[PDB]
Amino acid sequence: NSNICEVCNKWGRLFCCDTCPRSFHEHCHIPSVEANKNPWSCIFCRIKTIQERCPESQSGHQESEVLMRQMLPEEQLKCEFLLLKVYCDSKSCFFASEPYYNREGSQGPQKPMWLNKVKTSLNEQMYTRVEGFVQDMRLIFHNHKEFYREDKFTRLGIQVQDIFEKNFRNIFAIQETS
Ligand SMILES: [Zn+2]
Ligand SMILES: [Zn+2]
Ligand SMILES: [Zn+2]
């Protein structure tokens, strides 16, 4: 197995996947690595299994249909994995914890949002459809773009949104377009 966490790329107290060489800190894995379970399969393996069991799940889909899906166990897992893929990028640090807004010439957003809040929300089964999760994730980046205006720091929102959107299209097998 790897000797660094797959998400944060640091060593420490790591849990090893039994079906692939990935390793994780307890709370870097989403969901948090489970107490017992020998063997244990990580989220990457669990997602691969879903795809392998239903190869047709990789044919293209319309985003509008995906968003209306209820959060049954497989859709719950897919959103957990999508959230984890964002945390895997080091630029996610900027969006992880609760922001505050005090900049001359800008007003804070009406509805602040951050990754750890989305994480808690998923853990607590607060989203009934994929749409709820996706709206909160997109809101993180939209709030950032709006607040930072022409400061070059706005680009961090663009960058992390692009990681989100690429992984959304991959995980949910969104139909490719130009
Ligand atoms: Zn980690
Ligand atoms: Zn694995
Ligand atoms: Zn099938």
mmCIF file of C-alpha atoms and ligand atoms in Angstrom:
data_model
loop_
_atom_site.group_PDB
_atom_site.id
_atom_site.type_symbol
_atom_site.label_atom_id
_atom_site.label_comp_id
_atom_site.label_asym_id
_atom_site.label_seq_id
_atom_site.Cartn_x
_atom_site.Cartn_y
_atom_site.Cartn_z
ATOM 1 C CA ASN A 1 0.000 0.000 0.000
ATOM 2 C CA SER A 2 0.890 3.660 -0.381
ATOM 3 C CA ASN A 3 2.618 5.281 2.654
ATOM 4 C CA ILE A 4 0.871 8.645 2.194
ATOM 5 C CA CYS A 5 -2.831 9.597 2.366
ATOM 6 C CA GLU A 6 -4.453 9.644 -1.073
ATOM 7 C CA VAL A 7 -6.341 12.882 -0.272
ATOM 8 C CA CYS A 8 -3.811 15.148 1.525
ATOM 9 C CA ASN A 9 -0.534 13.466 0.470
ATOM 10 C CA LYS A 10 0.807 13.377 4.066
ATOM 11 C CA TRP A 11 1.961 10.437 6.223
ATOM 12 C CA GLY A 12 0.473 9.737 9.622
ATOM 13 C CA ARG A 13 -2.090 7.272 11.061
ATOM 14 C CA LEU A 14 -3.177 5.662 7.762
ATOM 15 C CA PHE A 15 -5.826 3.019 6.963
ATOM 16 C CA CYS A 16 -5.052 0.823 4.006
ATOM 17 C CA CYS A 17 -7.464 -0.331 1.347
ATOM 18 C CA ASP A 18 -7.675 -4.150 1.018
ATOM 19 C CA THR A 19 -8.521 -4.076 -2.689
ATOM 20 C CA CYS A 20 -6.234 -1.334 -3.996
ATOM 21 C CA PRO A 21 -2.929 0.162 -2.810
ATOM 22 C CA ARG A 22 -4.496 3.456 -1.560
ATOM 23 C CA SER A 23 -4.294 4.677 1.978
ATOM 24 C CA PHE A 24 -6.187 7.264 4.048
ATOM 25 C CA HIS A 25 -6.286 9.290 7.153
ATOM 26 C CA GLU A 26 -9.457 8.457 9.061
ATOM 27 C CA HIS A 27 -11.279 11.791 8.347
ATOM 28 C CA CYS A 28 -9.709 12.379 4.945
ATOM 29 C CA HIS A 29 -11.680 9.363 3.576
ATOM 30 C CA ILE A 30 -15.379 10.126 2.969
ATOM 31 C CA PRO A 31 -17.237 8.610 4.635
ATOM 32 C CA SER A 32 -14.718 8.541 7.642
ATOM 33 C CA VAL A 33 -12.922 5.194 7.659
ATOM 34 C CA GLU A 34 -15.213 2.585 9.206
ATOM 35 C CA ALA A 35 -14.432 1.143 12.753
ATOM 36 C CA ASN A 36 -14.161 -2.593 11.999
ATOM 37 C CA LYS A 37 -14.707 -4.177 8.496
ATOM 38 C CA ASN A 38 -11.951 -6.659 7.592
ATOM 39 C CA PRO A 39 -11.533 -6.544 4.687
ATOM 40 C CA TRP A 40 -12.178 -2.824 3.967
ATOM 41 C CA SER A 41 -12.622 -1.384 0.534
ATOM 42 C CA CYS A 42 -12.110 2.394 -0.016
ATOM 43 C CA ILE A 43 -14.483 4.681 -1.883
ATOM 44 C CA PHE A 44 -12.481 4.389 -5.088
ATOM 45 C CA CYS A 45 -13.001 0.609 -5.022
ATOM 46 C CA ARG A 46 -16.680 0.918 -4.072
ATOM 47 C CA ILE A 47 -17.281 3.266 -7.019
ATOM 48 C CA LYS A 48 -15.420 0.971 -9.421
ATOM 49 C CA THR A 49 -17.645 -1.894 -8.260
ATOM 50 C CA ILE A 50 -20.847 0.059 -9.084
ATOM 51 C CA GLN A 51 -19.491 0.674 -12.615
ATOM 52 C CA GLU A 52 -18.432 -2.968 -13.076
ATOM 53 C CA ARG A 53 -21.795 -4.352 -11.868
ATOM 54 C CA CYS A 54 -23.663 -2.042 -14.303
ATOM 55 C CA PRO A 55 -21.421 -1.258 -17.284
ATOM 56 C CA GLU A 56 -24.353 0.664 -18.868
ATOM 57 C CA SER A 57 -24.142 3.167 -15.984
ATOM 58 C CA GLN A 58 -21.284 4.719 -18.013
ATOM 59 C CA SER A 59 -23.373 5.613 -21.044
ATOM 60 C CA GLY A 60 -24.025 9.352 -21.306
ATOM 61 C CA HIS A 61 -26.643 11.087 -19.189
ATOM 62 C CA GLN A 62 -28.328 14.516 -19.222
ATOM 63 C CA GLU A 63 -27.364 16.697 -16.239
ATOM 64 C CA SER A 64 -31.009 17.566 -15.645
ATOM 65 C CA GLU A 65 -31.889 13.884 -15.096
ATOM 66 C CA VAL A 66 -28.876 13.332 -12.819
ATOM 67 C CA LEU A 67 -29.806 16.312 -10.597
ATOM 68 C CA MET A 68 -33.345 15.020 -10.037
ATOM 69 C CA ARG A 69 -32.181 11.655 -8.776
ATOM 70 C CA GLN A 70 -33.102 10.863 -5.238
ATOM 71 C CA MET A 71 -30.200 10.280 -2.826
ATOM 72 C CA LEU A 72 -30.437 6.466 -2.605
ATOM 73 C CA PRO A 73 -27.243 4.659 -1.396
ATOM 74 C CA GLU A 74 -25.461 4.659 -4.767
ATOM 75 C CA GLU A 75 -26.126 8.393 -5.413
ATOM 76 C CA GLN A 76 -25.114 9.178 -1.806
ATOM 77 C CA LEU A 77 -21.804 7.312 -2.473
ATOM 78 C CA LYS A 78 -21.242 9.111 -5.752
ATOM 79 C CA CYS A 79 -21.658 12.540 -4.105
ATOM 80 C CA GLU A 80 -19.290 11.472 -1.264
ATOM 81 C CA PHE A 81 -16.676 10.491 -3.867
ATOM 82 C CA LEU A 82 -17.179 13.735 -5.840
ATOM 83 C CA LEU A 83 -16.657 15.723 -2.596
ATOM 84 C CA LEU A 84 -13.541 13.670 -1.883
ATOM 85 C CA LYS A 85 -12.145 14.407 -5.346
ATOM 86 C CA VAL A 86 -12.368 18.152 -4.563
ATOM 87 C CA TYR A 87 -10.557 17.683 -1.233
ATOM 88 C CA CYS A 88 -7.840 15.828 -3.153
ATOM 89 C CA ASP A 89 -6.761 19.135 -4.736
ATOM 90 C CA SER A 90 -4.557 21.200 -2.479
ATOM 91 C CA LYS A 91 -6.465 24.414 -3.457
ATOM 92 C CA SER A 92 -9.458 23.019 -1.589
ATOM 93 C CA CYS A 93 -7.945 24.449 1.613
ATOM 94 C CA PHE A 94 -9.346 27.832 0.631
ATOM 95 C CA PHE A 95 -12.905 26.503 0.597
ATOM 96 C CA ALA A 96 -12.818 23.926 3.444
ATOM 97 C CA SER A 97 -13.683 25.939 6.523
ATOM 98 C CA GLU A 98 -16.149 28.712 7.248
ATOM 99 C CA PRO A 99 -15.277 31.945 5.413
ATOM 100 C CA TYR A 100 -15.634 35.516 6.581
ATOM 101 C CA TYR A 101 -16.087 38.624 4.503
ATOM 102 C CA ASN A 102 -14.579 42.017 5.245
ATOM 103 C CA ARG A 103 -13.169 43.626 2.135
ATOM 104 C CA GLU A 104 -13.498 47.297 1.121
ATOM 105 C CA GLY A 105 -15.947 47.538 -1.807
ATOM 106 C CA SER A 106 -17.499 44.049 -1.406
ATOM 107 C CA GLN A 107 -20.402 42.671 0.538
ATOM 108 C CA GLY A 108 -20.432 39.066 1.834
ATOM 109 C CA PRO A 109 -22.733 36.522 0.240
ATOM 110 C CA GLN A 110 -26.304 36.002 1.374
ATOM 111 C CA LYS A 111 -25.726 32.275 1.814
ATOM 112 C CA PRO A 112 -22.190 31.334 2.745
ATOM 113 C CA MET A 113 -21.058 27.784 1.965
ATOM 114 C CA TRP A 114 -17.958 25.675 2.469
ATOM 115 C CA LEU A 115 -16.711 22.140 1.947
ATOM 116 C CA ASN A 116 -16.846 21.031 5.573
ATOM 117 C CA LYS A 117 -20.479 22.152 5.750
ATOM 118 C CA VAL A 118 -21.295 20.070 2.689
ATOM 119 C CA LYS A 119 -19.394 17.189 4.284
ATOM 120 C CA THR A 120 -21.495 17.406 7.476
ATOM 121 C CA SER A 121 -24.661 17.741 5.396
ATOM 122 C CA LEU A 122 -23.886 14.552 3.511
ATOM 123 C CA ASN A 123 -23.004 12.713 6.734
ATOM 124 C CA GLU A 124 -26.291 13.813 8.276
ATOM 125 C CA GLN A 125 -28.332 12.716 5.143
ATOM 126 C CA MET A 126 -29.627 16.283 4.687
ATOM 127 C CA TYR A 127 -29.757 16.110 0.865
ATOM 128 C CA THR A 128 -32.771 14.288 -0.666
ATOM 129 C CA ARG A 129 -31.702 14.713 -4.315
ATOM 130 C CA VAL A 130 -28.371 15.041 -6.080
ATOM 131 C CA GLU A 131 -29.475 18.611 -6.973
ATOM 132 C CA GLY A 132 -29.147 19.709 -3.298
ATOM 133 C CA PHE A 133 -25.515 18.603 -3.092
ATOM 134 C CA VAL A 134 -24.596 20.051 -6.493
ATOM 135 C CA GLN A 135 -26.269 23.402 -5.747
ATOM 136 C CA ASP A 136 -24.305 23.811 -2.461
ATOM 137 C CA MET A 137 -21.002 22.844 -4.174
ATOM 138 C CA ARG A 138 -21.573 25.334 -7.058
ATOM 139 C CA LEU A 139 -22.535 28.005 -4.524
ATOM 140 C CA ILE A 140 -19.106 27.770 -2.848
ATOM 141 C CA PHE A 141 -17.425 28.890 -6.086
ATOM 142 C CA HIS A 142 -20.087 31.368 -7.140
ATOM 143 C CA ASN A 143 -19.868 33.165 -3.751
ATOM 144 C CA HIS A 144 -16.092 33.373 -4.141
ATOM 145 C CA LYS A 145 -16.245 34.821 -7.683
ATOM 146 C CA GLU A 146 -18.793 37.389 -6.660
ATOM 147 C CA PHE A 147 -16.912 38.506 -3.510
ATOM 148 C CA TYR A 148 -13.408 38.762 -4.949
ATOM 149 C CA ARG A 149 -14.560 40.636 -8.073
ATOM 150 C CA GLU A 150 -11.436 41.649 -10.043
ATOM 151 C CA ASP A 151 -8.855 40.550 -7.518
ATOM 152 C CA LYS A 152 -6.764 37.847 -9.122
ATOM 153 C CA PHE A 153 -7.718 35.642 -6.129
ATOM 154 C CA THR A 154 -11.006 35.008 -7.959
ATOM 155 C CA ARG A 155 -9.075 32.526 -10.056
ATOM 156 C CA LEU A 156 -8.820 30.048 -7.189
ATOM 157 C CA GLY A 157 -12.614 29.684 -7.393
ATOM 158 C CA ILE A 158 -12.423 29.054 -11.132
ATOM 159 C CA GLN A 159 -9.706 26.478 -10.623
ATOM 160 C CA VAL A 160 -11.439 24.459 -7.903
ATOM 161 C CA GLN A 161 -14.807 24.706 -9.727
ATOM 162 C CA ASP A 162 -13.175 23.200 -12.786
ATOM 163 C CA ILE A 163 -11.993 20.217 -10.652
ATOM 164 C CA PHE A 164 -15.525 19.830 -9.303
ATOM 165 C CA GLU A 165 -17.199 20.020 -12.743
ATOM 166 C CA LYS A 166 -14.761 17.582 -14.478
ATOM 167 C CA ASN A 167 -15.227 15.068 -11.691
ATOM 168 C CA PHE A 168 -19.044 15.577 -11.713
ATOM 169 C CA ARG A 169 -19.163 14.805 -15.476
ATOM 170 C CA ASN A 170 -16.922 11.706 -14.926
ATOM 171 C CA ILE A 171 -18.606 10.240 -11.847
ATOM 172 C CA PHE A 172 -22.138 10.764 -13.066
ATOM 173 C CA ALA A 173 -21.280 9.884 -16.692
ATOM 174 C CA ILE A 174 -22.614 13.090 -18.155
ATOM 175 C CA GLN A 175 -22.979 12.927 -21.958
ATOM 176 C CA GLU A 176 -19.961 14.466 -23.652
ATOM 177 C CA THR A 177 -20.552 17.653 -25.710
ATOM 178 C CA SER A 178 -18.784 20.514 -27.530
HETATM 179 ZN ZN ZN B 1 -5.076 12.771 4.672
HETATM 180 ZN ZN ZN B 2 -9.350 0.875 -2.707
HETATM 181 ZN ZN ZN B 3 -26.778 -3.194 -15.275
#
